[PDB]
Amino acid sequence: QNDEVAAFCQSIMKLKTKFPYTDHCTNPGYLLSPVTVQRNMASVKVSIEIEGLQLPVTFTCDVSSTVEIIIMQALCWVHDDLNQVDVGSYILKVCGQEEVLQNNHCLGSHEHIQNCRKWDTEIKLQLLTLSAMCQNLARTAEDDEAPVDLRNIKEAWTATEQLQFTVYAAHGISSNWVSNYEKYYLICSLSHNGKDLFKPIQSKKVGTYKNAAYLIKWDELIIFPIQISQLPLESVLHLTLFGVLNQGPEALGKVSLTLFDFKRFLTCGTKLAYLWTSERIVLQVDFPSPAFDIIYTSPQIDRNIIKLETLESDIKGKLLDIIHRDSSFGLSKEDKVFLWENRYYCLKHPNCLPKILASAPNWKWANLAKTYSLLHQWPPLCPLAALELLDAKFADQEVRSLAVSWMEAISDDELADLLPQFVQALKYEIYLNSSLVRFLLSRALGNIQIAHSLYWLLKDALHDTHFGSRYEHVLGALLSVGGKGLREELSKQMKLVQLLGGVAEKVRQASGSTRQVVLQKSMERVQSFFLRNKCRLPLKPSLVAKELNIKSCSFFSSNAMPLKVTMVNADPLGEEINVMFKVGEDLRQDMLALQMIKIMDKIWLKEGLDLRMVIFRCLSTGRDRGMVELVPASDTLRKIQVEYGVTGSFKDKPLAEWLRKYNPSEEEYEKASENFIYSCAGCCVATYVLGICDRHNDNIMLRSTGHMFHIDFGKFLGHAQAPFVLTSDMAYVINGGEKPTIRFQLFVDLCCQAYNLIRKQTNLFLNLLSLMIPSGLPELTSIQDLKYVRDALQPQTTDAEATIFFTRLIESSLGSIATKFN
Template sequence: MSVSFPDQELRRTAVQWMDTISDPELLDFLPQLVQALKYECYLDSPLVRFLLRRAIGDMRIAHYLFWLLKDTLQDSQFSGRYQHLLAGLLCCVGRGLREEFDRQCWLVTILAKVAQRVRDTSPSSRQAILREGLEEVRQFFSVSSSCRLPLNPGMLVKAVNIQSCSYFNSNAVPLKLSFQNLDPRGDNINSGDDLRQDMLTLQIIRIMNKIWIQEGLDMRMVIFRCFSTGRGRGMVEMIPQAETLRKIQGEHGVTGSFKDRPLADWLQKHNPTEDEYEKAVENFIYSCAGCCVATYILGICDRHNDNIMLKTSGHMFHIDFGKFLGHAQMFGNIKRDRAPFVFTSDMAYVINGGDKPSSRFHDFVDLCCEAYNLIRKHAHLFLNLLGLMLSCGIPELSDLDDLKYVYDALRPHESEADATMYFTRYTHTHTLLFQCLTSDRSVQAAV
């Protein structure tokens, strides 16, 4: 469905093939299909009719299609086309869903204004300004008894828990909001970062996870939702019972990030029995391996102990994907991210059960290789998904050189044995590579 295939009969046949996929599968690829609309010769095309028909039949597809189209209105070259498609969708879905979309847009606008006011004020006044702004959100819920969040149409919120709301002390000062919901959880409403890149990264990781599970390999990945609602704003689901590695290491003092025991001690504290701890370690080994493979393939950079998190159950996961496809942070002419993926000494301590190598570490490496080769079998799927997003405006995904990074990482032209040898040799050369980072950066080592 890319620009390389303009033949109308070919595109019509591709749409016919897609008609056989289920609604959940279609949701996995919806962002790419919205981008593919740019390459249609006519506004009335088989792809347009396909998407509208499937949106009429499933509210989740209608919901995400609405917000994807809203986000693409910022594309000056194609905004006219997307405006017509959005109008067509609103005509098809009916009055009830149109009113629901209006409420969501109203709520997102209020939250964006609140976030802007919090960001523009002095740090000492931010909490007071946030509480003041959230009163407007409370008034919204007094008029609209409930509203679904753009993040998830299944999440019906009825109020905002003002006392539980705060903000993050990063450059963008995103808000941390807690809504009252049938399934209570917090949602990080981020109105300062461009979440399109995070959204794409998490989509690719979610598809990787589905492939692993379909192949009978459960990597215990933590999959969370992220959705862009416009340039510089969006929503990220927060995972309960999880802390950043920085906070966990901080429990051991200012030198905690240089010690080997913090992660193991923290998991032991939350899993006091032997069986509980062993289960947590197992979750850690699998999820850590999955994260290593995913971040390696996607070239996710700027990894440090503030954007790697750990659940009390032992599941490890990454957040904040502002750098990917090998676009590393630079210190002058030197790349800060020199390791293929982050693997710290305290992670090794959990896996080995101590400070000496054990057979479990070799099992961990074998697990990484198995997960890597399962993704390699679907290399062209991931290259096509990323290729369709070349025109979406993400700065770090703008030309074929960016796609080449993933191609080189997956090595689809090689046999499984050769690719495995490359993967293990490439990562092994970084075994003794320690990056002593400044500020709050942890000491990092790569397998």
């Protein structure tokens, strides 16, 4: 471990050398404003503050214009000719947010622009030079030159010795264990590619040793029916410790051991493993210790150039049927062998390589040379497709390194929203230094948003009972390489989340009349914090808070008593910061639901379908606590139904009247109704595919602009289970009347269109969810959960039949009032 850590640190300094503090492109010192490229790149109004002008210039821009020419248009308003105006010295930033628009991207591609348009709120930018932009987070020269802190040989293929090891003892047993358990045993399993190579082997059941209740001694030899020369390089031994009660046996802990170390040497001699149960226990397994070191050597390369082969059409039809399948999921055994034999015909369809590798008959050393030979004459995959190659089922390091090399094509903006799965895929790298971790660290060096999100994600990952140590090394590398500016900023944000969490705990423990007073008094400590510190908001680190608005702070009087934290912007050009902080309930599953909704939205927008979706932020900042974006001027459907229900008996006019009071004019009410149509279509498709069937008056929320969204994702992937529901007031808003109109047909067409656009990306959604399996969410625990989503996506069906299917889902959701529609 120490020597692996040292080699890791050497490599990481080598990675640092490639990001000097002088290069502004990779060391900007500011956040980049996020972008999601949208097709068909319509006009909007933008107001731009300019130095020397008392009023900002306001003018109409083409949504499809790049930020560069928009800067020049703003410069043209103030100068008659740009001959001696330093045009390249200028940037645009969002008013009140320390994020900079990206020059080479369309104004319409930027998320801030897109939200403002959905919102119809003022686009308020500011023109300045790089010199005036805050670059406090930038790395110094100091940081660059600082160090990072966190005899004979036998080739393995010639090694005939059985794999064998002696499970010797476990040291450190607790008093609670001695009282509750008589005896103990280990179950030993041997795995590669996340799959058992053989039946697991169970040890004898022994009690605590004589005159030692902290010691469990087995001194037992365990032999597996395999030789050293048959072990894949990435073979892992799993030891799970069990306790049989004295008064079913229950699992006390688990350790894993790689059979080869990061330098290809076979594990030899005594080896100590550590398992935690809350405390640390030490297992000792003794491996054989011959007079020679055994090293793994990969088979030697095949050089081949493979256009020159048979053809046929009974076979070629079946083959292209396999290639265009949704995924490798559920691929039958016959299909696997058929594809494997025909694999060299597939070379002009790169994104089917994961199917091909999943159809390999085995990963025996002898069969590796022909796989490797294929892999290095294979075309580049698209990054999203290469995700599958980083899942558990592909442990081979050539495969994974090659997948990371294909991943390098992905943009930072796309990668930012996929980081959770990458952090999880770290668990399938057996060694500390890997292509993948260096890729992630490299991206975090060149982009502050990626570094910030990686920070918070690794910080959750630390609570893993099995992988926490590895994540500590990775997080220490991120913090080391990030520089002192970023480090002190993250420290301020960490202290802020701790202080806010303390306030929330005190508020919940307090009750009734002594609760808001407890709030106000407990916020004193955070007020002190701001008195000595200006702090970036962890949810959106481009917002700088200087002070707490103690007056507007309150609680929501709901389950888990959430805090409404109101903060003063440090920028006068910006507006208040309002975030909810919540303690008690686990926000990671809400984060996964939100991320899936965001990815569906991205997919739609890339195909030119804008369903006007509400995409709000949520950040787990610890064990069962975090902070959540607050969508302004929105209320739950029941709240609307009942506040209307005191004045009316109409059954179906509450939502329409609610929207009418905030959109009185006819143009404004039609616009709000249209927003409702589109956002509701998006919500229905998401409800069905992601299996969120807990929808009810309290779960669905509606914004005064007319946009509908979800806020609670308690039953997520609950496909056990009218998938969604369309009560009559929603139908009234969509129709505009009490009878069906062409607006309902537009809603049905929008739903089916979006549904098919997601069915086309079934592989991405299956891969994005399986990569989250090992994160430990209660109800994404197996590949079976993925099967339910795939069945919902109906992969085999055509787009036309899928349209028919979803249309009848809609009319099922309409219930009794579905008689009135065609």
